[PDB]
């Protein structure tokens, strides 16, 4: 039972690490899409 509780705690820690990785991926995606939208607007303004 202690080994099963340790395995459940390891699975919960892996799920928390996956949630933190998803939050970091969302933050990096927003930080990259900010300059990407800026470059897209700068490219659209020359075509406009």
């Amino acid at each position: 039972q202690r080994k099963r509780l340790a395995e459940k705690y390891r699975e919960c820690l892996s799920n928390k690490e996956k949630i933190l990785k998803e939050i970091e991926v969302k933050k990096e995606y927003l930080s990259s899409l900010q300059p990407r939208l800026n470059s897209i607007m700068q490219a659209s303004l020359p075509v406009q």
């Binding site: 900010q34 939208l37 800026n38 607007m41 659209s44 303004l45 406009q48």
Partner: peptide, 28 residues
Amino acid sequence: ESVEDKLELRRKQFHVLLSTIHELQQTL
């Protein structure tokens, strides 16, 4: 007059898009 209204609507849409891009550049 219809073609001029469509061109003025396209120009106002382009100006609104440029203003939104300027607001996004000012916020970021």
